[PDB]
Amino acid sequence: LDPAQWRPNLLTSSSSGTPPPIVYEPYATAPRLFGRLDYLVDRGVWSTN
C-alpha cells in the first residue's frame, strides 16, 4: 500500500473569512479553470494519484 495514492490533496486553505476568495481568470482555458493532472514517472512507468 503506497502512501501516495491514499492521501488527501491540499487544494486551498480557507481565506480566513473576509475578504471572500475572489479569483479572476482572464485566460479561462480548461487547464486553468478545472485544474491540471500531472504524472510522475519512475523507471519509465507513468503513474498518477
Binding site: 491540471r36 500531472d38 504524472y39 510522475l40 514517472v41 507513468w46
Partner: protein
C-alpha cells in the same frame, strides 16, 4: 511532458512599440483591448514637404 512546471508569471516593465502598415493595424484596431493598451499612435507621413 508528464509533469510540467507551474511557472508563476512575472511583472512586466517593458514598453511595446508595434510597427506596421496602416492596414495591418486596421485589423488590430477593431479590437477594443488594443485601443486601451496602445494609446500613443505615431503617424509617419508618406510625404515630406
Amino acid at each position: 511532458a508528464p509533469a510540467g512546471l507551474e511557472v508563476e508569471p512575472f511583472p512586466i516593465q517593458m514598453q511595446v512599440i508595434l510597427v506596421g502598415t496602416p492596414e495591418a493595424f486596421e485589423g488590430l484596431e477593431e479590437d477594443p483591448a488594443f485601443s486601451e493598451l496602445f494609446r500613443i499612435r505615431a503617424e509617419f507621413s508618406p510625404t515630406l514637404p
